[PDB]
């Protein structure tokens, strides 16, 4: 009888599915986590076009497993306590059309035995801290990496060191240390455990998909360090830029988080409303919240200029500078400037034409834009002290201009006629050269 099986549970951790007579006894009601988990189930099931295979690690009394099997999922639940599995099975038998199997076993061994594709979704709620406590953080990171490797999505509720108990001392400084080796992760909620006032964060993690409520797609590769608070995911015709505002440990000062926030916000604003006369990459999706923000754009051909420079690839500096200057002059005509023109913000296509790819540093108002013209000289010099004729003549001509006349329209016009300009080396000069050379060091 169920009555007996429930009584022999060492703990009624969860609601007993279908049996509200024990709801008052359950340590956690599970309705809040279930609301969120079912939402994520539906998103992923919608994206894949079918009911999911779900793995429930440390499934306890089966509540999540049964609740998802109720919605048509095929589920396997694992727990190392016989009493828990006995209850799960008895509950499944009350619901014979549910495709639900349960097994006694250890999560460590199950994870090792998993095969990719066997399960679409795995859930591991409030169980990994037990594995951390016995086996350490590094083994748990590797288990979670494998779990992510073999599924499409993982949902974790993770206990945290701020919980007032003795086992908190063995926890990592931040729960994200268990998952940050995985490609994609997002905080999706925080839950009351009824053990203390400290809530546990729930994360959605994937090694194969961008999983954003509005955009759910496989990616084939990703990158953290461009050219660690920013991640880029590459899919067939998209790039997803994912910025963390909230990072663990020291990592971001207050100012840096706000700048991450500012840049991504500014980039969204610009790309959703780009200026006429400028071909901006197209925007497929975007959103922001307290922890992070994201932007999905059309994927552009070409390579990042800084990579090409580093990997000594052959470049046409004339075509790169011409194309870039043309776009900067067109921005300026619409009252837009870019505050940070550097090789890692520039992409060069197969025909050696260049374009900006980060619009975080775009600005709309201001003497000005004189400083930006100055840096652009450094850019130029780093792209190559190092300027042959007629690039040196171009820079010399600009320096002879009254400063109120420095702007990108002028920079472009002089660039286009640089072959006609007088020879700098024939003049006393000589300072423009030395100031930028010191700038280009500085």
Ligand X SMILES: C[S@@+](CC[C@H](N)C(=O)[O-])C[C@H]1O[C@@H](n2cnc3c(N)ncnc32)[C@H](O)[C@@H]1O
CA quadruple 379, 383, 385, 388: dihedral sign: negative
Within positions 330 to 389, which residues make up the interface with Cl ion, using CB under 5 A? none
Within positions 377 to 396, which residues make up the interface with a second copy, using CB under 8 A? 385, 392
Within positions 265 to 324, which residues make up the interface with a second copy, using CB under 8 A? 290-291
Find out whether the peptide bond into 337 is cis, omega within 30 degrees of 0: no
Contacts (Cβ under 8 Å, ≥6 apart) of 295: 240, 241, 264, 267, 268, 271, 283, 285, 286
If one asks whether residue 348 binds ligand X (CB under 6 A), the answer comes out as no
Within positions 180 to 239, which residues make up the interface with a second copy, using CB under 8 A? 181, 183, 194-199, 207-208, 220-222
Query: Which x/- pattern, by CB under 5 A, does the window 24-63 give for Cl ion?
Result: ----------------------------------------
Gap between the Cα atoms of 419 and 397, Å rounded: 12
User: How far is the CA of 277 from the CAs of 218, 272, 280, 322, 355, in angstroms?
Assistant: 33, 15, 9, 16, 13
Query: Which x/- pattern, by CB under 6 A, does the window 71-110 give for ligand X?
Result: -------xxxx--x--------------------xxxx--
Within positions 128 to 187, which residues make up the interface with ligand X, using CB under 6 A? 130-131
Binding site annotation covers 108?
Answer: yes
Closest of 301, 309, 287, 292 to residue 239, by C-alpha? 301
Residue from 6, 76, 125, 297 binding ligand X (CB under 6 A): 125
Closest of 45, 39, 38, 107 to residue 66, by C-alpha? 38
If one asks whether residue 134 binds a second copy (CB under 8 A), the answer comes out as no
Contacts (Cβ under 8 Å, ≥6 apart) of 424: 389, 392, 393, 395, 396, 432, 433
Residue whose token pair is 């660039």: 415
184 or 270, CB closer to a second copy? Answer: 184
CB of 147 to Cl ion, least distance (A): 13
Return the one option of a second copy, ligand X, Cl ion, none that residue 278 interacts with (CB less than 5 to 8 A, by type).
Answer: none
**Stretch of 112-120, 279-287, 333-341, 351-359 lying at the interface with a second copy (CB under 8 A):** 112-120
What are 277's two structure tokens? 């006369």
Q: Which residues bind ligand X (CB under 6 A)?
A: 13-14, 58-60, 78-81, 84, 105-108, 125-127, 130-131
């Amino acid at each position: 009888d169920l009555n007996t099986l429930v009584s022999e549970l060492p703990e009624i951790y969860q609601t007993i599915f279908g049996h509200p007579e024990w709801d008052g006894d359950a340590a956690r009601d599970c309705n809040q986590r279930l609301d969120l988990i079912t939402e994520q189930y539906d998103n992923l099931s919608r994206a894949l076009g079918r009911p999911l295979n779900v793995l429930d690690l440390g499934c306890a009394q089966g509540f999540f497993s049964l609740s998802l099997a109720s919605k048509g999922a095929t589920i396997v639940g694992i727990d190392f306590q016989q009493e828990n599995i006995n209850v799960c099975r008895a509950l499944a038998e009350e619901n014979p059309d549910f495709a639900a199997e349960f097994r006694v076993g250890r999560i460590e061994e199950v994870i090792a035995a998993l095969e990719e594709g066997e399960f679409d979704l795995a859930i591991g709620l409030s169980v990994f801290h037990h594995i951390v406590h016995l086996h350490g953080i590094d083994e748990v990171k590797r288990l979670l990496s494998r779990l992510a490797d073999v599924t499409q999505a993982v949902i974790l509720e993770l206990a945290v060191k701020e919980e007032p108990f003795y086992w908190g001392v063995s926890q990592p400084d931040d729960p994200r240390e268990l998952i940050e080796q995985c490609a994609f992760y997002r905080l999706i909620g925080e839950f009351d455990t009824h053990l203390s006032p400290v809530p546990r964060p729930m994360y959605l993690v994937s090694n194969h998909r961008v999983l954003i409520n509005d955009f759910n797609q496989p990616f084939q590769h990703w990158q953290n360090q461009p050219y660690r608070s920013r991640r880029y995911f590459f899919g067939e015709d998209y790039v997803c830029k994912f910025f963390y505002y909230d990072m663990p440990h020291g990592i971001l000062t207050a100012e840096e988080s706000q700048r991450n926030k500012y840049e991504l916000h500014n980039e969204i604003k610009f790309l959703t409303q780009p200026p006429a006369g400028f071909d901006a990459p197209a925007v497929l999706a975007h959103g922001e919240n307290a922890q992070s923000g994201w932007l999905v754009m059309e994927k552009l051909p070409g390579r990042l200029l800084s990579d090409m420079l580093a990997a000594g690839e052959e470049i046409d500096r004339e075509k790169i500078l011409g194309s870039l200057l043309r776009s900067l002059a067109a921005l300026e005509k619409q009252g837009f400037w870019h505050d940070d023109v550097r090789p890692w913000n520039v992409m060069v296509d197969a025909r050696q034409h260049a374009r900006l790819i980060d619009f975080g540093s775009i600005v709309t108002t201001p003497s000005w834009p004189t400083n930006l013209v100055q840096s652009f000289f450094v850019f130029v010099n780093e792209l190559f002290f190092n300027l042959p004729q007629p690039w040196s003549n171009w820079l010399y001509a600009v320096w002879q201009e009254p400063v109120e006349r420095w702007n990108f329209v002028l920079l472009l016009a002089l660039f286009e006629k640089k072959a006609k300009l007088p020879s700098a080396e024939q003049q006393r000069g000589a300072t423009e050269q030395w100031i930028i050379a010191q700038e280009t060091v500085l």
